[PDB]
């Protein structure tokens, strides 16, 4: 997981335009719609019975903000992702019992959401930079599992 300087610049430039709260809710929502087995982790969030019930679920949306906040924070530490995500890795393993495959799924859903929001601006080179990022984040979140 090594972005070039130009890729780092591209990632930072695009992220400045992201509504992190909105995008987080949308990414977590689409994860739960597209891969509905992932709803297993969110029973407490209430109604997840239809795509609209999931996407507009306020608890899903609020949780998406946390997720994207932590992601946003990781973008500031692209050369130390394992360290950045170490305590969250331990938490997702020990307390939450979340299969890290879910981090890979969410990363690619987030890429879809960025493409949906940005359209043509989400160019193939911009995507490739973000793919390095989401793979690095997923790998970091998996790293302290045991």
């Amino acid at each position: 997981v090594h972005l070039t300087p130009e890729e780092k610049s591209a990632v930072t430039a695009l992220w400045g335009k992201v509504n992190v709260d909105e995008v987080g809710g949308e990414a977590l929502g689409r994860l739960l719609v597209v891969y509905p087995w992932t709803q297993r982790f969110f029973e407490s969030f209430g109604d997840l019975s239809t795509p609209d019930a999931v996407m507009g679920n306020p608890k899903v949306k609020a949780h998406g903000k946390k997720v994207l906040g932590a992601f946003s924070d990781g973008l500031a530490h692209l050369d130390n992702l394992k360290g950045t995500f170490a305590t969250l890795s331990e938490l997702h393993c020990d307390k939450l019992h979340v299969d890290p495959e879910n981090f890979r799924l969410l990363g690619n859903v987030l890429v879809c959401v960025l493409a949906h929001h940005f359209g043509k601006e989400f160019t193939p080179p911009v995507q490739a930079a973000y793919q390095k990022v989401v793979a690095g984040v997923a790998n970091a979140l998996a790293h302290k599992y045991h």
């Binding site: 929502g29 795509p51 493409a115 940005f118």
Partner: protein, 141 residues
């Protein structure tokens, strides 16, 4: 399995793609080669750089196969039979790569179809692409 709603959603979204099918197929391939460099191992004989006639031509082939699959959405194993034979006996692409191309097709569609790429439609398209991929890897062994 594709539900009645999945098939409605796929037909509507791919129909909206319309004349752009070949362009979008080539864009998805480009996105794949840049995002997932291991996929380039299957194309040592191609120019893979931007604007490649070979990538454009291949994108059109891929897109046309998807159009045929949509047309025969209830009989994909048979409609894609010759193509699955080619994949199993000649191309021999590891199954993981189909997930990479599928994802890049979703990203392409998302980038071009703001109103149409809803969460439900995204779900149906992913299922559809996985179903096509399953058929194309079904005869490997």
């Amino acid at each position: 399995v594709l539900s009645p709603a999945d098939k409605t959603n796929v037909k509507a979204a791919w129909g909206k793609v319309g004349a752009h099918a070949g362009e979008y197929g080539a864009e998805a391939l480009e996105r794949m080669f840049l995002s997932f460099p291991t996929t380039k191992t299957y194309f040592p004989h191609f120019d893979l750089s931007h604007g490649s006639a070979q990538v454009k031509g291949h994108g059109k082939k891929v897109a046309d196969a998807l159009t045929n699959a949509v047309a025969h959405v209830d009989d994909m194993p048979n409609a894609l039979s010759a193509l699955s034979d080619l994949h199993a006996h000649k191309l021999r692409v590891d199954p993981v790569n189909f997930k990479l191309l599928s994802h890049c097709l979703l990203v392409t569609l998302a980038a071009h179809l703001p109103a149409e790429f809803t969460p439900a439609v995204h779900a149906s398209l992913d299922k559809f692409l996985a179903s096509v991929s399953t058929v194309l890897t079904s005869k490997y062994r």
